[model samples]
Each structure stands twice: as structure tokens, then as C-alpha cells.
Target: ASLTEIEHLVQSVCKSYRETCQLRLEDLLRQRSNIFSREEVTGYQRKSMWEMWERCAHHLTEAIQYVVEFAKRLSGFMELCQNDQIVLLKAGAMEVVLVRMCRAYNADNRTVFFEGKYGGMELFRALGCSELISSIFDFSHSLSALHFSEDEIALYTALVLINAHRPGLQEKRKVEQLQYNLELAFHHHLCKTHRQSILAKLPPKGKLRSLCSQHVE
Candidate 1:
């Protein structure tokens, strides 16, 4: 496929997964989130907090469909063995979701825009892991400091996906080659400034791993 085609295929399904959360948050306000509303929640607050996380984790796993569409369509990704594809798809999909979280975030007010309202640290405590939320937000806006064209973000996340050295690969070299070509696309498409900024911003895998593990845990 053409690079533009590849880029759009990778980028498009992202909002589908994330918007489900948008719809879910809306549906919640209509009913369930009332558990934590300003009215006297009393001991119901206990159920509120636990069920809150239950819904959070519930929505988190279910959103993978958006990531799934991209995996099948991402140029060379489909060429891998089926077992290998499943293996690698599971590997980096969390990172892809976090990458897209930037979309829902508003650096202006330091809030995540959801269900048409600004969701701030006000409810961030609901997630019950304060330091984890802190790491993700720090990771979010810091990564947000530099901007990318769709071409670059797509390339970066695709490279994020087709990882080599992952276990259970029926064949590894083919995916290695795919990762190499994805690497080439990034270099070829970016100008010096864009390339430099991305080099500085994009290569920090440890930080991403640390923050995403925070999410997963």
C-alpha cells in the first residue's frame, strides 16, 4: 500500500476505540456515575470506587477492536503468520492506546476531554492510584510538547507494533524486515527538524514501558 494509505489505515481506527469510552462515560452519567455524585453517597461511595475501576478496566480491554482493525490493515502486519500476528498484536497494543490518549487530552487546561466535559484531577483520584495517574499525565503532556504530522505518529506506532525479539514467533526475520521498512519510512518522510524532535521524543521506550505498566497494573 501507498504511504498515505498506510498512514490513514493506522490512524483511523484509533478514535473508534477511544470514542467508545466517550460514549461509555456519557451513558455512565445518565445512570451509574451518580454513585459518586455530590448528593449523599455515604457508604455507597465504597461501591462507587470499586465499580468505578471495574468499569475502567472493562472499557480498557474492550477498546482493542480499534487497535485490531489497524493490525490487520497496517501494510505488512497481515503478512506474518497468524500465531505470530496474535503474539505481536498483544505485545504493543497497550502502547498504541496510550499513544492515542494524547488525542483526548487537552494541554490547555490539563484535563482529559470526555463526554463533552473537562475531566481533571478532580476525578483522577477515583482511579485510586495517584502516582500512576501522575506518571501517565507527566508522560502525556511531555510527549505532547512536540507535535507530529499524522505520517510520523502512524509510522512511530506501527514501528511500535511490529516488534522483533518477541517470543513465540513462528518466523522472526520477516517481521524484522517489516520493522526495518517502517523505520525507513520515518527517516525518509521527516525533515531534519521533525526527525530530530522525534528522535529525542520517540526513542524512550523505557519511560513508555514504565508508564504503561503503571496503567496495566
Candidate 2:
């Protein structure tokens, strides 16, 4: 059926975000990328793995900052109990950040572009994330193929933030209800817009449900 008022509100919030917070995030990425890209590791000598990890962690933190900003703009995210809000943010931030940044993945070159530069897979491997990197790249490539509209991205991001199973939640049932409603909205939009042309290639509903769990765990 048609979108409910809550879903409509979510779309509106996301539209505003695209114009505001999202643009700011894009500029931040660009500035950060210029800074990171300039410090090129020369000679390809084996760099200190610990130093590599520290650098990687720095970039991850920068990316998650954008997610935190977006979450603060979501309708009920800030209204949740402090502990519950932390729980969701702690558990879901990476997935949300990665999904949002998937727009920068260049499938043709098998590289992830952050800000304005390519991040070599070796940097991730140095941090003991070879498997994680592979999984994310595969997921990003598949997700990018969908070419999600701003509305779809908004709903999906909402689903990520309202993840029901995140640990330390004070009211699991309340979060579950929110998740259910968001999922219904997502499916409604998906069916109306892409069912005929792309549903077959999209991840199954069950897989969609577990996207964050796979990444966060």
C-alpha cells in the first residue's frame, strides 16, 4: 500500500539530510582524503603493521562521525534511552558508515575510494582485515548495483539504526516494532519501484535483515 506518515517523515528527514549533513560529510571526506593521500608510503617497504592499523582506525572514526550525525537527525533515535542509543550506535555504526560510503566504491577497478583517493586493499590486510575487506567489497559491489534512490537509502539507514537485536537495549520489543515498520515500508517501496526489473537480483529479504549483523559481528 501507500507509505505511512512515519515513512513519509523518514523520507523527508533523509531529503533534508542529503541537502545538509550529507553534503557536509562529502566535503569532510574530500578534505580528509587530500590529507591522507598526500602522505604516500614510499618504496612499498613493509610498513609497521601497527602504524597501518592506527591509520586505518583513524579513517574509520572519520567515517563513523558522519553516521553519528545522521543518526542524531533521525526522528526517534535521540529519544531512545541513553544506553539504548549507545547500544545501537555502537553496534550499527560501522555497517551504516560502510553502506553509506559504498557510493564511492569503484567496482570497475575493485577499489574503495574514500574522500578522493583509492584505499589499497593491502592497508586493510595489514590490519588483519583481509576477510572483512573482501566481504565488504563484495557487499558494496552488490549494493551499488541496486542504485538505491535517496528514499530507499533513507529507509535502509533507518532499519540499520533501529536494529532490534543490538546488545544492551533497554526495550527490545519497542525497537523490534520500529524495525518491523521500517521493513514494511522498505518492502512496499521496493515492490512498487523495482519488483519487475531488479527484485530477482536483490538480496533476499532474510539476507537484507541480517546485513548489519554480518558486518557488526
In terms of lDDT, which candidate is strongest?
Answer: 2
TM-score for model 2? 0.71
> What overall lDDT, based on C-alpha atoms, would model 2 receive against the true structure?
0.64
Cα misplacement distance, residue 167 of candidate 2 (Å): 4.2
Model 2 per-residue lDDT tens digits across residues 1-217: 2457645755655664574334344553354333224244231225566877677678777767777777777666677788887898887776667667566665656666643456655535445657766877877788777775566666677777778887788888878876776677667666667544554665654554466566555
lDDT of 1 by residue, 2-105 (tens): 77754544444333333333334334334322233333233223446677776667767665666676677666677788999898878788887787565555
> How do all models score by TM-score?
0.74, 0.71
Report clash pairs, candidate 2. none
- Model 1, stretches more than 4 Å misplaced? 1-47, 192-195
Q: Provide the lowest-lDDT 10-residue window in model 1.
A: 32-41
Residue pairs clashing, model 1 = none
